[model samples]
Target chain A: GPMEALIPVINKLQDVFNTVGADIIQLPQIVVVGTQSSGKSSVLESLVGRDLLPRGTGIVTRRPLILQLVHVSQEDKRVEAEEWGKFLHTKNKLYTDFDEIRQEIENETERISGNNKGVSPEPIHLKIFSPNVVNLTLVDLPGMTKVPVGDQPKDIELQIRELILRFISNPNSIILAVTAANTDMATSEALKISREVDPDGRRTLAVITKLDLMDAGTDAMDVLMGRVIPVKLGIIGVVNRSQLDINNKKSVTDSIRDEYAFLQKKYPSLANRNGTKYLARTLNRLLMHHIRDCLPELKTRINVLAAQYQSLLNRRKEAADMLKALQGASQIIAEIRETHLW
Target chain B: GPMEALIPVINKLQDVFNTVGADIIQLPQIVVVGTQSSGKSSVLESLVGRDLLPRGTGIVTRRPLILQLVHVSQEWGKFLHTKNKLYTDFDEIRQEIENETERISGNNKGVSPEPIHLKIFSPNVVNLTLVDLPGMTKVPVGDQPKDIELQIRELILRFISNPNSIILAVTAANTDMATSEALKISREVDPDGRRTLAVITKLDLMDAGTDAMDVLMGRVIPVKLGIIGVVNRSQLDINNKKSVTDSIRDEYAFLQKKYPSLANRNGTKYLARTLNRLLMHHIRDCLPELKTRINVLAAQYQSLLRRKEAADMLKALQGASQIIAEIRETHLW
Candidate 1:
């Protein structure tokens, strides 16, 4: 019923929509979810072809970062507007005393517009255009472990769990679950829950990372695939070639083998020698295979879902608008009756 | 006397244990401690086989994660219950309020009926568990550079000092120690502490993470044995496997030849390269090998001292548990 209703809306806007091909018109929402230290940020960096998030351990806590492409001319305007909104809204809240709020707002406005030419004294919101794809938005939430406690203030632990559910429950959103090659109890638990959330198994994909450290003698690719498939809704792996030279197979293999032997002997029972390579291969495969192959299907799913959701939102908006109009008329009538002058 | 008292208890337990040849399990509680971005999570991930925490370059400011294993069936039940709790609680809270507040408390009763979830609607629990410690650099109140250094000095400086000074140095008693040999080397190199470990990390990265200090300092005879020549990780081209190529092999061979001890059993080699060798050697040399052999027998005497310390910890835990139990009974009853 929702799709049926949206067809007329789409047709009405066909002239404007014709410029953007339907194939590229709908962009899938990709949410990266992973445990702390799983290299979710690294995977995203690899995907977006840039090092955006800070990497490694000990750096915990972050705000959600949404990356979307904007036309070059519109980028500055959008950034300025977003910065202004953040400054005003946040400043207003900080100085809750009305008089102070007013004074601070005025001061801020004057300072921003004054002789300070270099800095905006506003939130930095920049939109950089990329040549890769069109009409796509990338939402990078804070890593699962360090989801801001204040963001979901009531129960700090529930914050991550809630955010995860919100993303997974949204049919339109595709979940990219990043995991490391190593199978720890906590990570395994996370994977199992992720699978349960996305039962259809269509919308979720797994990315196992940090293949550089796997032991060399073992078939890391196979090991990674085997580890991922049973619990992950859909499994994929990548070999991060950015860190290693894929062309020099012999040397890489030798180094890997040596490392594997070393780890095997050192951690005789626990370590897999070729685990790193397996991770790398699995990651590369996922990016190349699932993401590239399912792009079309993903686009269609997103478009259909978006149209449906948008319609519901539109109905609510219409109701609110009608209520506002009625209130306005009532207020006017009340004013006229009190003054006897309208 | 404590060990003596425990012996009878052990004897009674052994008599009971003999009837059933169940595995005698002793799980080691290992807390990984390190500076920020010092590969603590990577080490844990390597040990446990999963990324439990989100890793990146930033200040870590959270309590330690205590990971443990559980059965699959329990994991599944926990998952279902937890998910239900999250949804129901969120919905209830969402309905009650809007933009004014960021969060609202959920119904604790609706939460999963488990102390900790081992599975999420599944029949499996993870095999290996890890407890990831928060970095020393981000320890909230003592997070500043000076404070961190003071903490490190208090905890680890005496350990690095000669054993003769162990008794008199009260600072060595601090539990949170940074005793890694790398820390020692860094301290030695930069006495003024003008440079942070980041500079050393950058050099390490530039050198492919395998460069030995001896080689970097151009020493003809290496003091450290079994050290792997630092292979620059950046040098290895991921796309072109061939680029690790002949040249890299040749360099590796040259280094291996020079450090013949590098070919030792991998365990020994790792110990030697990581500076554990120095610590062990120093300990061995200070307390003679023969004296150390007798130390095992002397453990009974030494354990009395240890028991007193352990008793303090146990007492603390008991107090904590009592408070927690009281809260649980009164509020959560």
Candidate 2:
């Protein structure tokens, strides 16, 4: 049942923190890191089985979304009588529509970063509580770009890169380094930057996007197997669904139908372990096992941290943070604007 | 918001203490103490907002039901699914709870500590873990053997003895509060006069003229845990097939009109909210104990699943390394 305790605990801490930097505490995380248009948001949306991200001509995840996906089963919603959305800017208002959620994200981004091509660490947190997804926490950073686009400041590219590095650099983060298969693995700027921070590649996971874009006679077997560029965290091969398929609103089972045949014909041995579908399962397995290892350390680290503050007296705050988190999952930053004031 | 703040604090500790708990301490729980047909099931239903109980008649509740009612918002259902479900079909919820009772008791009459735990995730509820102990029975009836009295009391005593609970003793009104079996049993466990709250039910039928003013004012049988009176819909109300919503309105008006001094305190809403206050306050009292226990057990559980389950620390630790072994053993790469 996915170890019922982990998400609530981590989530409670997330409230006190959404869990990141100068952050004296260390919690288990699956950090999705990649470059501009390298398909970072797509992978996250796909893994969560939802296309809630604002994808357009130039997908500036400039406004970072700490996309907290949870498993709030049908049973939960009916009981709670609440299956709504809220932005943290106003933890008081509630939204029950998808377009409104996107609108809130759009509105907040402009309000915080302006409608220009600038990036900021100021995050727009959202939670998609569904039984469909695992209890996963993903901080989607503004994609790392070497050059800025229209109306963007000259240093805008670097601004975004630093923003990207800020998240992946966390020692406790499980960096999901994404890149396109068509691009040279060496020259691909995303992999290049990820290598510097995660040098040993121990904490970095390579998510090879655009498997369909590779040359007719070519295959990424060595790259996917971690034989080439040797990623200690292992390499994953995936296909970014065409906008046509997505616009047509393709269901996962149908997407898998194509991948099942494609990977089946392309690489029979790896077919069972290939594609975006397989990656989600692999991600779940990886995160689950990772949690077991981290759970003990989680307790240990906190005790040590608790000891540091005094006889480390005053423990209510610690326990309180946890209790709030038991209300975790659907870890949505419920920002219901105070805008209702007359 | 303070109540909201309280949940995270308690839930967090629950998660940590769980890891080392075969040794450390039990989760702080709310125990409901009442006599046969004393509005125990009705009060529970009112609190959770669904009729997820066996309601026909005849002391149907034999075995104790360890009700873990978690409030579900979006992140709901994780607990019940063990990951957690959203349940709206109230009748479905009703059927499932009844099925559980049937599964345990069968056609015969019996009881056990092996409680029927129905983890209900409701949007209206808070993350409450209340236990509905068996309604105190006076004697044998309907296939129920003798010593039934002792068995029920014996079972309830073991649960309340933990001292980690806030015993809510429910007594029916217009009745004697001193010999009120509910209070009689509660005073036995909490002789020190701590951890006992009285919930006086059936206010509507407390005689035509004489009111329970003295009881509500605590002028009679003073209790440390405090006394709250609620007018529950009786079996006659049930027979009339009266709507709860209607009963609540009438109950509220009746209190305001008949006992304006009570100030709208005679409804289920006040009763439930009051209980929430008492429950959390009791929980806060346990903080030092939980804090000391957790702060101590933390070191024992910390690590990459490398150590023992801290069972020796009143709990045990184990898992990560075992997983890696399976990954290697299966040679799945």
Candidate 3:
């Protein structure tokens, strides 16, 4: 029954695949981005249907995660490097002080390189199976505010800044920049900078998270989207559906409106009078125009992109194979020279 | 050869140890205290000879670290726990979309209570080491200005009122009173309190920390120590060795000055200006007359105090041993 329901969605995906010339099977590289506490990881979990990222703490995911869909037989091979990477990063010899721990990581990296003849690269790949999608690859980049220490010097703040720049500069990737419902100037600045890298802005989408934190009244939505108008990107609103179920939508709406009203009356400084209306209107516009209507086109584009990616991968593999063959021949020639038999 | 060369230094250390009572070990419980970016960790690292604590970026090492001295074999067990704790704290299972990592950390904590243990000790132990102090902002004492005032009130102002009392309160149980003068004052404000003993630490490494900016001036040492004359502590400052050497030498000088009555007579409004002169004259005339009487009285007082402390230590050891034994027996049972 689930498969039947997803058929149309798959068809839309297929259309995008055709448009992008990706109809020939290839893995999709989907990257998720957002502010520190925005639910970027949560959205990925909902899509993949699993909580892979830690929540509650400000910015939990501090490293890039690459997931690929592969055949059951090849799954082990696909995940082997990732497993090894995690093991190497985590392994600690007994009596190893902090200084020794750092050295051990460096030693593991060297070992990996030596074994692979210097061809070893980042070991960050996982295999998964999606019944609806034939082949998909998801890349969960570190949250914009929390950068991995491995990528930069121990300066975390600088690392975060560097990571944000890296993602913005990645021209091939689509950016889904998520912000909190109560967006601040810092979020706007980040979005504006990202928009500069993606001027046409078609590849960028804004997902305003924690809608539950704001008033449910359409008024707040109006203000929120109006505030986001400067970014001039299509905005998506995501509410914790769990919260919606716990408190029925009507009660939730009433509670939010009441809280908003209280804030307006008691503390005008804290309240966003127009936000509720702006956000609701934006959500409606997104659901009707972007999600339900334009999603078909979006999926078609995604599929097309995926095919292009596959072709790229194929080219890479061929080049790699050619290089390997050349290297093998070179090695034989070196041996002959060493023995003075050539 | 390197180990062999270390013998002379070791023998010199032994000689010094012999001079100081065997029990008079330098158990310098260096507590890292300052506002953020005050280079507290840097100071500690210079002392410990390694950067045991993580420095830089978004709040590395959120919890407290207690570093103790132990043999190489014992260090491993503690290191394992520290690594596991770091892993547990940094683990992100959402990256996997699976609960496996979380489950492992949960088990690790349960199995190993000292998950964040990091120990560093050898034959010449510095006594105690602690890290990851909660920022001064989080201290239960009132906010910043109040906290600063509290320090000043206890260390400087309290001494002004009490001249005769032994300002350095002794005993582990009563250590807080010694450290926090405000706490002592709150208990009971005495019209006449003991002269305060201000222990100025890291006087040489003032440039390494930010919070010490206000107190880092050449004249700050005299003001801090309540000395009548402005004597700079940072003058002969070497990176690490100089700090230790100066501190030890100063301790000896302080004791020499504290034990005499002429030294007490120097407690004029301008004590430093007058004390040296007063001590010189008193030593010349009063030494013969007062030496024997003072020595006998001091010996009698010292014996009485030693007896009291020995009794206290015995009670403390018995109570601690009982607790440990009970815990072990309960586990077996």
Candidate 4:
């Protein structure tokens, strides 16, 4: 709830630095990362309430996608709830239909990656100004894979690890280490890599996904707790819509109600903390906490950089004076040369 | 045979004038041209009755090919490719031509508008002079300069504008004559039919039962010097090692069957006779002007030799002009 103010602030910082083409500004970001087939796409689609990612098996999300989901009220809406998108690559050209957002992402990915699965560091900045969203900024990265697929670079596992480190290495970032409930938490590559960068787990939020598929009799009672590898920002468990439900045209609203019932029945002690609703509540709570946790230090860093750049501006004036003196001498030489010619 | 009488008079005067750069001397020349790949090179080769052109798929004939095909009674071949020495082998002459063209334009798929001068002293044909210029390509291809068509068109125009030159605008029989770029350029420079002659090739390749009788009659699109239609050798016949004499027999037989009237008028062989006759009249026309220019250039050469001004004054003034020119050019950049 308190992250409402910080969304626009961090988004403004994204615009300012990206406008000037610099990596100078460090802002609070929620970085979504996981291994392949970890239900990472499902988690973001549940949050945005749309199937917006290109669905495939390997390395589908191969670039940094900085998606800014702005929660628009009726007052903020000003006109329509027909959720629109704007990509910075097309100079913020507005995409009216939600389906076209996937097309633009494919075009942008191919433009940089050249019709391949290889990733590029060039992030596609998209603004989803919608009523169904909260004002949250997150980066969606390619799922970490161990073995490279056909035509994928042989060192792709190393490439992805370095990429994940680049995002989570920022002290102000909140890492969402997604893993399916069936996988061991101690051996989860997403959690292990995040832990290496965020050893103390100061700002990581672990999301244990596919909770309903945890087997017929077993449950994730100890896993959701910090008994396994512990995280300071705590863990969140969420249940996504099953393949049968999605293929049967079951709406996400009905699916949400069904998830609340299933998770509430399975983990009675964990009550309202079972589905995406409680997951969203935890995200809203912890994201605000991460921003508050880093604001004062980030402010002091920005202030120091601003002072250094001010001296650079002063040297610009000195250079301009020397250029003026150079022009004057050139004109004097030209006058003498002209006299001789005549 | 009638043109052979005027040849030596023009040749002797040409020697005195080529002491000045020959292109500047305005000698009578027949320029051959058309859109690229529209059989312009083959038209010249057929007129020469040999495989003399450097042929390829696209823009193969670059540069203004200045060829003087002199038919001598005794066998003697002379060209700069043989160090301007004399020889008797026709095959060596063709090989020398290829070597010379490759040396000047390079062995590549590009163009140069510079003229390549060669002299063929053979006893088999008529005495004639023709500039087989680069074909007027519509667009440039790989490695060719972008303004290739403009360069070719401007080169053709420059050569044809000399009052003593005759324009042989080449086009294919099947294509519309009005759209032929060579004829369009010829019409622009010559305007009236006084100097331009249309040599329509591919006469036998017209569609079934569709003859180019009207094209030969100049009724399709009339030109001032009328039209000449000739069918050159096909690539198939060339591969089969058929001689151009065989090609001429095929062309003559077809023309006699299709357009009996045209069997005599504008065959490729007839075009050469027309060209030499045109030059004979041009020599007669330019003789008085030729004597006048020779006298004028003689005086200019003398003055240039005796350029005895106050040597220091002339040096100082020329030096000052050169300095000012360099100063302005420097500032322009």
lDDT of each: 0.35, 0.60, 0.36, 0.64
The list of candidate 3 runs beyond 4 A from truth reads A1-28, A69-123, A146-154, A214-220, A231-233, A241-342, B1-333
Error of 2 at B136 (Å): 82
How well does each candidate reproduce the native contacts, as fnat? 0.00, 0.00, 0.00, 0.00
- Candidate 2, residue B228: Cα displacement in angstroms equals 84
lDDT tens digits, residue span B95-121, model 4: 666677677777765677667777767
Which scores higher on TM-score, 1 or 3?
1
| Candidate topping DockQ | 1
Ranking by lDDT: 4, 2, 3, 1
CA deviation > 4 Å runs, candidate 4: A1-342, B1-27, B70-74, B81-87, B123-127, B286-333
The TM-score, computed over Cα atoms with residue i paired to residue i, of candidate 4 is 0.40
DockQ of each: 0.03, 0.00, 0.01, 0.00
Interface RMS deviation of candidate 3: 23.5
Worst lDDT window (10 residues) for model 3 chain B?
B169-178
lDDT of 2 at A235: 76
Which candidate, 2 or 3, has the higher lDDT? 2
Candidate 4 lDDT by residue in tens digits, A105-135: 8888888887656677778899888755555
lDDT of 3 at A16: 39
